[PDB]
Symmetry: C3
Subunit: 334 residues, 3 copies
C-alpha cells in the first residue's frame, strides 16, 4: 500500500452490452488504477412483445450493467452516482472484491449522492457485481441491478497447460430472471413507480418461479438483426453472468472448446463442452472457434426457459460451409 498515489491512472469509457470496452488481453506494463464511472438509472423497461413492463434499476442505464475489464493486481476505482431523479438508495457489491460485503457496506448512496470505491483485483476471473441494499437485496438484483467484471491474468488467457488463448471477439450476455406480477385475469400489472410494485413482486419472487428469463433485458434482445456476429475461424469469448438463478448455456450447433464454468481463470477450463452450468451468483466464460457459418442460437438449455420464457440469443456467422464436418446426404424428401 505504498504507494497507489504513484501508480498510473487510466480512465475507461464503458460501452453497452453485449459489447465490451477497449482493453488489451496481455497487460501493457505495470499495475494501474483503472477508473470507471457509472450512473444508476431507475426506469421502466419493456421486456416482451406484449408490452410487459418492469421497473428496472440499471447500472449505466442497461440490464445487465456493463462489463468492466481490468488485470490482475490492478486497482479498480469506481465512481458511482445515484442522481436526484431516482427514488431509492443503491450500492454495489463486487464479488471480485475482498471486504465490507464486496464494497456494499461502503457504497450506500441515496438519490443525489455519489461515492468512490477502490479495490484491488487480486483474483483473476469473471465475477458478478450487483446492488445489495440491506433489507432489499433480492428485489434490486431481480430488477436488473447486476453485471459482471472480468479480471484478466496479466499474461492474458491460457488453457490448462500454459498455452495462450487469444480471442478475436468478446461478447457479454447477462441473463436476468424477472418476476412480474399478474392480476386475477392473468395479465401482467403495470405500476407508476418502483416502490408500488414491491409487495406484489415479493409474492411472485417467493414462488421461485420467474415469469421471464431474458438475455440483455428483453425477449429477443440479441436476436435476428441484433444478433452477435462472427466469422468462420474467429475465436470468440462469451462471458455469461446470472446474479440470482442457475443457468446452463449451450451454443446450438457449436461447443464450448474451453469453458471456465466457474468463471475463475486459475481453475483449469473444462473442454469440448456441450452445455455448461453457471450457478446463480456467478459468471462464467466459454471460448469457441467457429467452424461453420450460418445462424447459431445461444440458449439456457432448460428449453422451456429458452423458448417459452425468453432465454435465447443468435450468433450470425459468415464463411464457407465445411462438408467434411457435416453434410445433407439426402435432403428431406417423400
Amino acid at each position: 500500500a505504498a504507494e497507489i498515489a504513484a501508480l498510473p491512472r487510466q480512465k475507461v469509457e464503458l460501452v453497452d452490452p453485449p459489447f465490451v470496452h477497449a482493453h488489451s488481453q496481455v497487460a501493457e506494463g505495470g499495475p494501474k488504477v483503472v477508473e470507471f464511472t457509472m450512473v444508476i438509472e431507475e426506469k421502466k423497461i419493456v421486456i416482451d412483445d406484449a408490452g410487459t413492463e418492469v421497473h428496472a434499476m440499471a447500472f449505466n442505464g442497461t440490464v445487465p450493467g456493463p462489463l468492466m475489464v481490468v488485470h490482475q493486481d490492478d486497482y479498480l476505482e469506481l465512481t458511482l452516482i445515484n442522481p436526484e431523479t431516482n427514488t431509492l438508495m443503491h450500492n454495489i457489491d463486487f464479488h471480485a472484491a475482498t471486504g465490507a460485503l464486496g464494497g456494499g457496506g461502503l457504497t450506500e448512496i441515496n438519490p443525489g449522492e455519489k461515492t468512490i470505491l477502490r479495490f484491488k483485483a487480486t483474483k483473476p476471473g469473471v465475477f458478478v457485481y450487483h446492488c445489495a441494499p440491506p433489507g432489499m437485496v433480492p428485489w434490486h438484483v431481480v430488477s436488473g441491478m447486476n453485471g459482471a467484471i472480468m479480471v484478466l491474468p496479466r499474461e492474458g488467457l491460457h488453457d490448462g497447460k500454459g498455452k495462450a488463448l487469444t480471442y478475436d471477439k468478446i461478447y457479454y450476455v447477462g441473463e436476468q430472471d424477472f418476476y412480474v406480477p399478474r392480476d386475477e385475469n392473468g395479465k401482467y400489472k403495470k405500476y407508476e413507480a418502483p416502490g408500488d410494485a414491491y409487495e406484489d413482486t415479493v409474492k411472485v419472487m417467493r414462488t421461485l418461479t420467474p415469469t421471464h428469463v431474458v438475455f440483455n433485458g428483453a425477449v429477443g434482445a440479441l436476436t435476428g438483426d441484433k444478433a452477435m456476429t462472427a466469422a468462420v475461424g474467429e475465436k470468440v469469448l462469451i462471458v455469461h453472468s446470472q446474479a440470482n438463478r442457475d443457468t446452463r448455456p449451450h451454443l446450438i450447433g457449436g461447443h464450448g472448446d474451453y469453458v471456465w464454468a466457474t468463471g475463475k481463470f486459475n481453475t483449469p477450463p473444462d473442454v469440448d463442452q456441450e452445455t455448461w452450468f453457471i450457478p446463480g451468483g456467478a459468471a462464467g466464460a466459454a471460448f469457441y472457434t467457429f467452424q461453420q457459418p450460418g445462424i447459431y442460437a445461444y440458449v439456457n438449455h432448460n428449453l422451456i426457459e429458452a423458448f417459452e420464457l425468453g432465454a435465447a440469443a443468435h450468433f450470425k456467422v459468415t464463411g464457407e460451409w465445411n462438408d467434411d464436418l457435416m453434410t445433407s446426404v439426402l435432403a428431406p424428401s417423400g
Copy 2:
C-alpha cells in the same frame, strides 16, 4: 477428407437396441475412421407412464423414450437415416449436440410425415452428448414429449482416467431421464387427449410453471425396477451413461459411488473421483464408472429425493456375489424391547 476420400472409407451398419442396453461396440477402435450407419424411425404414440394409467403422447426416436444410444469413435462419421412415417402428424428433425453446424443438424433434417433424410457428420469431440428433436417454434414441446436420446463418441484408444491409465468397462447401461408435464383437470386427475396436437395448449401451461408432474427413467415410473433392474456382479466395472435434455439432475448410486465421473460427459476433461452425487445440467449427458464391491440391491436415483421417490426418478441394480464384512458389517442387528407407541 474430401467427398472422394469419404466415399472410400469402410461402412458399418449398426442395429440399435432399446435402452437401457447399448448396441455392440468395441471400446478401443479397430482400424481407422469409419462411416457408421444408423436408421431410426420416429413414432408418435401413446405411452403409459405410471401405475395409475397416466398417458402422454410421446414423440419417440425408434419408439422408445429415451431414444437409443448410438456409439461411434472420435473422427468416425455418423450417418443417420431418419424416417418420419406418413402415420405421424408432426414435422420432426434432429439436433446432435455432438455435431458442428446447422443447429447440430436440425436445420438440415426437417422432415414432414412421409419424408426421410440422411445426415452425416464427423464426430470430432469425444464424450457423451444429448440429441433431441428441435422443430422451429415447437422445440421444448417435442423434447419434453420424450424426443431425445444420447450418443457416445469414444476416444479411439478407449477411456482413460485423469493420469492416462486405461479404464475398461465390463457392462454399459444408458439411463435417459425425462421430465413430463401432464395437465390436470378440476379434480386433480391427469387429462387424456386424442392426438398430440389436442394436448398442446394445456401442456404449455404446465411447462411454464417449470414444475414437472413426473420425472422418470426409461419412459415410466418403475421402468428399471423389479424384474427390469439392471444387473451386475461384485468385481464388475460398469459405465452408466445418464442424459437429461431439458432439466438438471443429480444422480447417485445408493450404497455405491461414482469412482470416476465425467460429470460434463466429455472425455478430454479429466473425471472427478470418489463422487457421492454428481450433477448433470439440463441439455447434457454425463457418465460414471463404478466397480461393484458389495452384493445386493442398489437404487440409482436423482438425489432430489422428492423427484426420486415421489415423481419417479429411481432405478434398481441387483448385484450378485459375496458380502464383504470388512467394508461394512452389522455389529448389532436391530434389537431392544417392543414398546407401546
Copy 3:
C-alpha cells in the same frame, strides 16, 4: 480378522453444529475404530420468527445432525438408538459407506431399539448421511433427518499440487429445505403428531418449492450473537451439506480460496471461487483465509432463498482493516 479385532478404539463425544468435535487433521497413529453414539429425537421445533413449527426428526436432537470426523481407512462404528418415546421407524444411510444402501438396509430400528453398524471409510471427502426408511425416504430427509461426515486423508488436506492446507477453525453449515403446509387463509398448519402432517406435507413437497430454506434448523440461527467467528489471518474450513436440494454458497465479502465443490478430496479443488455449487445429495467444503475484518454474510446465492426464505448466516471477523485491498476514496456524499 485378528487384525481388525485388535485395532484401537476411540469413543468420541459429538458436539452440536455448527461446531465440530475435537479431531486431528493429520492422523495420529494407524487405523482405528472410531465409535459414535447418536440418539434420534422426534420433536417440535420453531423454524422462523413467526412461530412456524415442524415436527423435526433429528439425529442427536439437532438439525442438521452432527458432523462426524474420521480419517481414510478408519472404521466408523455407530451406535444408533431410537428411544421408546418416538413414533416412527428410522435408519441411517451414509453416502460414505459401501453396501446395503449405505447402511440403510441394516439399521431399520423401531422405537425401543438400537443397532450398531460399522463401515470402513475408504474414500476421503465430506459426505451426507440421512435417514431413508423404505417408502418414506424424502419425508424423513426434509423433516431434518440428515447430517454429514468428513473423512480426512491420512496426510490431512492438500491443494493437489501437494501443498498442505491446515485450517485453524472448521464450521459445519447444514442447509435444510422445509415444506410446511398452509391452510385456506395462508397460515402455516400445526399438527399433533408427525404422522398427522404426512399427506399435507407430501402435497407441498410435490410442488418442489420449499417454504423455508434455513441453516442450522431455523431462520437466523447463525446470525447476530450466534454468528460464526474468526480473525484476520485465520484459515477456516466451511463444510456445507444439502441432502435433498441444490445450493450455491457464497461468502459475501470473501471467496472460496480452495473449494472442493463435490466434497471429495482426491478431486483437486477449484480455486478463487465466488460462488460454488453443491448438488442436492452432497456435501462440499471451502477453505478461506480471512483478510479483512467486519461482518460477512454467508448465503445460498439464490438471493430469494437467502433473504426471503432464510438461507443466510453471518461471520464476525476481528482484526485490522487493510486499505490496500479496499478503501472508500470518497464516502457517500451529496
